[PDB]
Amino acid sequence: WEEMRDKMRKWREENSRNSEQIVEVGEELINEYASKLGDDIWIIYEQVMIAALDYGRDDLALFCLQELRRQFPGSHRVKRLTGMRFEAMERYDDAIQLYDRILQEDPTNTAARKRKIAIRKAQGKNVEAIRELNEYLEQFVGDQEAWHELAELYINEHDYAKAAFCLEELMMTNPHNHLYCQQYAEVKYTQGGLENLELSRKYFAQALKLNNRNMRALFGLYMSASHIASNPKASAKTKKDNMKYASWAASQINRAYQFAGSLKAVEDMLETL
Amino acid sequence: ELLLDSNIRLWVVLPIVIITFFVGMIRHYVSILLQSDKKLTQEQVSDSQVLIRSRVLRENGKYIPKQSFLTRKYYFNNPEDGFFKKMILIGGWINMTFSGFVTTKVPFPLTLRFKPMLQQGIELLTLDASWVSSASWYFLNVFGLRSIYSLILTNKAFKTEWEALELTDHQWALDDVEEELMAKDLHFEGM
Amino acid sequence: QVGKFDWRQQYVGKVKFASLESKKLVVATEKNVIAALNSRTGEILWRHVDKGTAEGAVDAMLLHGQDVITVSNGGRIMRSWETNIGGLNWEITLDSGSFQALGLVGLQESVRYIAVLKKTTLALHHLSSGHLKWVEHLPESDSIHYQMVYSYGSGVVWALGVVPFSHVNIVKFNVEDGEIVQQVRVSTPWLQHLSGACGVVDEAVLVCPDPSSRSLQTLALETEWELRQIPLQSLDLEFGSGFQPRVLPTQPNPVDASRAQFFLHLSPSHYALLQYHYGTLSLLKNFPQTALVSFATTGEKTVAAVMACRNCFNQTYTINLYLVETGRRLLDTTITFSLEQSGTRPERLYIQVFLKVGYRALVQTEDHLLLFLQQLAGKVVLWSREESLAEVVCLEMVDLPLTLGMFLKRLSSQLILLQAWTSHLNIDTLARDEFNLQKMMVMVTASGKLFGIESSSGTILWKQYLPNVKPDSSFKLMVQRTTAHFPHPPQCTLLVKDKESGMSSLYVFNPIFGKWSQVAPPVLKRPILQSLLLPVMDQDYAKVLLLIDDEYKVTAFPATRNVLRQLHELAPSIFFYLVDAEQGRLCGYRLRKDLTTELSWELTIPPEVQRIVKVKGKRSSEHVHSQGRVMGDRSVLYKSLNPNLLAVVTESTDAHHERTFIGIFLIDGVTGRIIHSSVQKKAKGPVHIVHSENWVVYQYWNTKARRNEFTVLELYEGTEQYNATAFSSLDRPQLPQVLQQSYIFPSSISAMEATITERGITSRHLLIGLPSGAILSLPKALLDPRRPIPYSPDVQIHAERFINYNQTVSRMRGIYTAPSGLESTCLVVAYGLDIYQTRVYPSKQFDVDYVLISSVLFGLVFATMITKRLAQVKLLNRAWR
Amino acid sequence: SLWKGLVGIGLFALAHAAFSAAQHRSYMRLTSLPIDIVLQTLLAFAVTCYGIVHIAGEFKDMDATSELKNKTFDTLRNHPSFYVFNHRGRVL
Amino acid sequence: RFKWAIELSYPVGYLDKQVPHASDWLAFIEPPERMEFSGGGLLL
Amino acid sequence: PPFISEAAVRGNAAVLDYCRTSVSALSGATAGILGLTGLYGFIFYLLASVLLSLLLILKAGRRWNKYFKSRRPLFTGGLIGGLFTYVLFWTFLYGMVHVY
Amino acid sequence: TVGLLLEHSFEIDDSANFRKRGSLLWNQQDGTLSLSQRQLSEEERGRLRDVAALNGLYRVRIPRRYVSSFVPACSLVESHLSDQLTLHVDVAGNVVGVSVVTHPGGCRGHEVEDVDLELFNTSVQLQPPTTAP
Amino acid sequence: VKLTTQAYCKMVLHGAKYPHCAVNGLLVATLFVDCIPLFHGTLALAPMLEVALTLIDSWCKDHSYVIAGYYQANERVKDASPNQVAEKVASRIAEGFSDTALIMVDNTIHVYEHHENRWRCRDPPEAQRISASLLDSRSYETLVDFDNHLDDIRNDWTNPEINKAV
Ligand SMILES: *[C@@H]1O[C@H](CO)[C@@H](O)[C@H](O)[C@H]1NC(C)=O
Ligand SMILES: *[C@@H]1O[C@H](CO)[C@@H](O)[C@H](O)[C@H]1NC(C)=O
Ligand SMILES: *[C@@H]1O[C@H](CO)[C@@H](O)[C@H](O)[C@H]1NC(C)=O
């Protein structure tokens, strides 16, 4: 039986928003198992709400918010949940005021100003979002959940030069995860440039090393190798050793798909260059 | 060898154990009930965070490229621009209540200099110290349960950081990983 | 404890005189004591003990209806008590006399004046005051044995005298003159006394029997010539073979003449009831099977109580009344009782009489007992009082007696105990208890009466009487076995001497039930001298208890093969030491393979300047824990124990304070070498000594500062341990070193002893008996001689550690201290003419609000489980802020 | 909760052994040690040690990259505190 | 044969300027055994 | 290896301390019951520590070096804090049973 | 001054055949005690050693002007004849008793062919009684 | 411009599976007969898009099919306009076919056409209700796409099961 509470804590453990299973598996617990959970309930009223809102329902939202007010009447965190539903039903100034109250009376309440940025991100004005975000970062330098979104924003504005700064800062605080590294590679290859491309290939390989199972960075390594080996700006030594790299990667991918058990198409692609 | 009563055993031994156990637990819980907040402002928070940034940059600036490392280091060390450029009562009571007994024995021989601490109430001055008092029981259980609880439960720093960042290299450490991977083979058979 | 286990019984002794007639009576006993016992139950109102020794000996009790009268100190003193609260009313002293007799007189109808007879003079005092009234002298006063006196109230007072075998002389005096009225002198040289032979029947009479001719010499003492005579031959009234017979008259009012009728005592069991007319006898009755008889008198009526053997036989004696004037037996008033012991004879009787008739009796039987009998048919003894305990000699304290298949046995036992717990919620009925404190007492006594007591609410459980025992003898008590070899019982022993023949007797028994065991002892043929226990137990657990003859040969009671074999083996490790105080010589003998003794050492003393007083030796039933006294500087200082040591004490024959001294000697019983020979000058006082494991103490008197003092000795060998496992006294040359000191004590002393508790851990105390009856405990470590705490300036008296706060003891001839099973208490006993028992706490009872315990327990538990759910909540609400 | 029950059982057997030893000592004092009690206490000791070993916890690797072997980008992108709702779920 | 070679084109601390003894054992002692026995006294 | 979690470390150390202190207490009791002095009970504590180390080794399997860089703490572990517990439980049960 | 005999006796049956080994000389005036002996001829030595075989006794005796005492052979023969004698007396001056002890100890066993034992290496010393305060 | 049942079906299925973020897809046929859901996420990144282009180009040349269209779908419901990315994508696709179709779903269908002009509009049934019924049958949870292939090779970008479903 315990399966479901742990599978509704999993989706809280890895920020996996999949919000049709959340509600379907939660509503049962929140309705008719309150006792069983035993004061592990005041968080299931907040995970369900912030996803049942995105499903569109809007009837369970207040069913949760009212109980939360009941047990936790005076607070500044549930003020956030009151200022979210507001902006769901296109009430933005009410939300800004609801935040400004707690912010003006209790600074060091980052969530509020974060949602204030979220409003602008919603409306469309990105420059203003960026300005507000950086102004926040100055005070609270270091919040990875911020940096990654800031880089994503710089991307969405088609600027592939300053995002890499944010990622470099981001891969300096936890450099044992392939994802940040391969994404830095993906943004610096798409940036073009010889120095940029060699940096890209390097960090590609450095990423793959860690997991030894990521496929994206492997394909990236092959493509970058072929690019250099058909780029008339490099010493012959670079060209030949990159051809060797590409051949070895090709062989390894052949091993991969062999292990799997189409093949011909990818092999034609491989022998293209 | 002293033929002893059992009323002694029960009503002298056990209260000591129970009381010290539960009062240590209660002290823990009340300490958790006492700690207030000391949040003051955002300023020292920002300073601390950027200090940790500098420290990190110092220690793991060998996974990023040269130029970005150098930008950050110079910025933090740019002339004038760097951000570092501008028991008592309970013991008394219990001894007052059990003032003079002989509780139990230890199965290994003690010399005589251990005596005045184990008994601490008794004017016998003839017993081998291996026979213990009651208050020593308290003082000893104190330790035993202090070891079982673990089972059941400014500008100075600015300038130090700046100077410590002066003497620093890049040490890219990223110049041979390519061959290292390419060296032998790839490894995955666990999908 | 003050009301739980400490009791005091007090006694007065064996009566000599007494007097009955509201709810109180009076006695006077051998031990110079007066008492006012309650006539409904044994209990005292006022003891007035004065002096144990002769100088407070009583000679004549006499009361007055509400006032007692007394004479002490061989005719000197004359007191006058109250009979109600012992409050003395007056007291005087008289001149030297032999106190031949005492009386009580009046003028015509009164009781104003009293008489005396000191064999030299005669007196007449007032009574209310005590101021003398007149005195005069006897005619010749040195040759006619003035042994008696008589009044008939009114007018005058006579006075008789007679030597054994020459003649009688008679006198008569008149008040306010002291003048000798005509003094008759008639010859009757056949009588040998007149004290316990004769008596005045009616108002001028002398009467005495001559068994030769079986006749009666009679005299109307008012006016008659030559003692007219009446033969006791007309009647069948033969005398006894060699029995001195006598008269028993009566005079219930000393002012009105004596009654005519009177008893007569012919032979051990022959009495008669005569009556005297003007000149002719009238006989009423004769009794051939009487042991004892008494008179008594109410307001006007007068009776006679009589005892009889019924069928002597189960000691079932009967008591009856007869009327004196007539002889009539009374249909009612016939008591039949019986004693507990086998040979026990009354030898005494007194009477109390109501006016309803009815009566009550008092009986002082031979073996120091007192019965008070009532006529009713229920409990016939209204109270029984045991006076033999007023002189105890030696005693002892004995312990009471005791009451995969393995897995299945365990299961069964556990089940049984479960069932028991669930179900839960006199001599033959008891056994010893854990950390035993019962410790049954066995005491022996100089009148030959063995007892047994519980030591807690002392109750006599058994008794025994062993006959043919003199007043001055010598006892020794030895305990052989205690509750082992289950088919075999416990048994103790007893050795008695006789003090006149040197003979000896060995009485063996079982201390628990009081019975002489099945076996017989060897018959002691020769005078025995000494005894030791030899704690090596034979096949039957019995210690051998060897004895020494006067022919210097041995005798053992359990003389079995095994024991004799053990002796033939280990004879030469056994030694006797003997003493002779007359000439002051000690001797020491040994054993051989067979049982003989070959002299080993000897030692004398000049008996003209030194006189042995007493001898001390360590108790064999002791354990010593620490072999050393650790100095302040991590230095050991070993002590010399020498189990076989013994102390001797002496004092001079010159009693002048100028050169009077006390001597001390320490000696080894085996070899005969002196460790120490000391002398303390300017002291005479009677001594009181103690000899512990390694220390010695004695008390004495300083005649140059006329005050009491102590002196204490300790013995240390050095820093090494010579042969620290065997201690043979044949091999120690190194005579130890001595430390001593002399403190002072501000009072007198009586018997002293030391506490004890097995394993000898706790502090060791000294129990002191003062004369006032105060007991006193003193800590040994205070008397240490390693003191610079100077030479003691009046070492203190503390009236806060007195055991007997107001439960005082009279004379304190000795003390006994015995061990518990609990190691922090010692059992105490004090004899001295009033017993005492208690416990002591030398180390504050260190091995033993009740509800408050579980109260705080559960308070804490619930406060814990209440604070948990508060911490959780506050933490959670922190999370959400 | 099997192992916890096992532990409780062994421990209770040990306490029963203690009780039996106490009563045995009282009986022998009224008048050195048997076999059955010894095997029982040792049984309890060993069978408690095994269980408390199994139940205390489970070891965890100390190579972090093993944990993130399978950590897809999509789970790591969606930053909750910047969630925003103007999208097609409305139109469901 | 590069068919798809696509070319597209205050963050605090960001600038692109290419900058460079005895007693101990005493307590354990056992009381020694006695060998001789001596009893008697004062000649009853 | 180069990159460490520095949290699983503490988890593993904590579970080790748990097991060690607990079995130490248990040995103290099971010794204090059938009271034995000096050499024998020290032999007992040491033999039990060895048993513990062996059991943990069994649990890991080939030592699974990803868990532990070295087999040292398996043997040594926290061995002092167990001594106090051991003697305390000698005391407790010796007292309760082999005295009164 | 006066003289006082000193009989010394030892046999196999622990009996008494008391013979002499010389006298003591006591000066009362100042107070001093000395000895004057004769030596042990062959048969005396054989008697002493055979008595020693059985752990017999050496007995010493003097008169009251009697008194005696004893000391084993085992503790003397192997001592090369170092005995210590004391003569305890009273306050006014009267013989009280005797005390004889050998130096040192006894019964280790080493015999010396009995040719050291011809000088009686003795020590004698007396004491009045030690007074006290 | 004629769009096949399964084309619109898989199009809207993809649009609904990852709604919170923009997505794109690649159509192969003007009679469009098949779509590819390939990506879901940022989409402003070349390399994975480029290997997808190359692989799909080679595979359809093996089967001699051509690339016939692009589609993009935004997350902002009111945004139905092209950024640089779709412009370049459809530019190269037109270079390869010169008749390609660009698509933007209103999501509340805005097919464009480029003839020397910035992808202007073109002239604007049962298959609608078909797809709606499927959606309400809750089957979009088993639709795999290129990104899933790059995560787990064990997927399949031909999506044959959904094809046979209809
Ligand atoms: C002895 O006295 C007892 C008194 O209890 C009596 O029962 C018994 O009959 C007497 N003996 C004889 C032979 O009558
Ligand atoms: C003590 O006496 C025993 C008796 O056999 C002897 O063996 C031992 O040696 C003696 N002690 C010393 C120190 O000689
Ligand atoms: C004589 O007496 C001394 C006393 O110290 C002793 O040492 C010595 O052994 C004895 N014998 C001889 C032969 O000196």
Residue numbers in the entry:
A (entry chain B): 12 to 272, 281 to 292
B (entry chain C): 5 to 90, 121 to 187, 214 to 251
C (entry chain A): 26 to 46, 51 to 340, 368 to 412, 417 to 463, 481 to 502, 521 to 883, 896 to 955, 961 to 993
D (entry chain E): 4 to 34, 40 to 100
E (entry chain D): 14 to 22, 43 to 53, 160 to 183
F (entry chain F): 11 to 110
G (entry chain I): 51 to 115, 127 to 194
H (entry chain H): 4 to 32, 52 to 130, 141 to 156, 165 to 206
Copy text verbatim from the article accompanying this structure deposition.
The ER membrane protein complex (EMC) has emerged as a conserved player in the process of membrane protein biogenesis. The EMC is an eight (yeast) or nine (mammalian) component, 248–284 kDa complex with considerable mass in the ER lumen, membrane, and cytosol. The EMC is comprised of cytoplasmic, transmembrane, and lumenal domains arranged similarly for yeast and human, despite significant evolutionary separation. The EMC presents two distinct and structurally conserved cavities on opposite sides of the transmembrane core that differ in size, shape, subunit compositions and apparent function.
We obtained reconstructions of yEMC bound to an antigen binding fragment (Fab) and hEMC reconstituted both in detergent micelles and lipid nanodiscs, with the latter strategy yielding the most isotropic and highest resolution data. One of the conformations, referred to as the closed-gate conformation, results in a more occluded membrane cavity. The yEMC detergent map, yEMC nanodisc map, and hEMC detergent map all show the unassigned helices in the closed conformation, preventing client residence in the gated cavity. Consistent with our observations, the closed transmembrane gate conformation can also be seen in recently published cryo-EM maps of hEMC and yEMC, which studied LMNG and digitonin-solubilized complexes, respectively. For both species, subunits encompassing EMC2 to EMC7 form an interconnected core complex, while there is additional density capping both the cytoplasmic and lumenal domains of hEMC, occupied by an hEMC8/9 and an hEMC1 N-terminal expansion, respectively. hEMC8 and hEMC9 are paralogs of each other, which have not been identified in yeast. The large hEMC1 insertion in hEMC constitutes the majority of a membrane distal beta-propeller domain protruding into the lumen, a feature missing from S. cerevisiae. The lumenal cap differs between hEMC and yEMC, with a four-bladed distal beta-propeller in yeast and eight-bladed distal propeller the human complex. Mass spectrometric analysis of our hEMC preparations reveals slightly higher abundance of hEMC8 to hEMC9, so we modeled the cytoplasmic cap structure with the hEMC8 sequence.
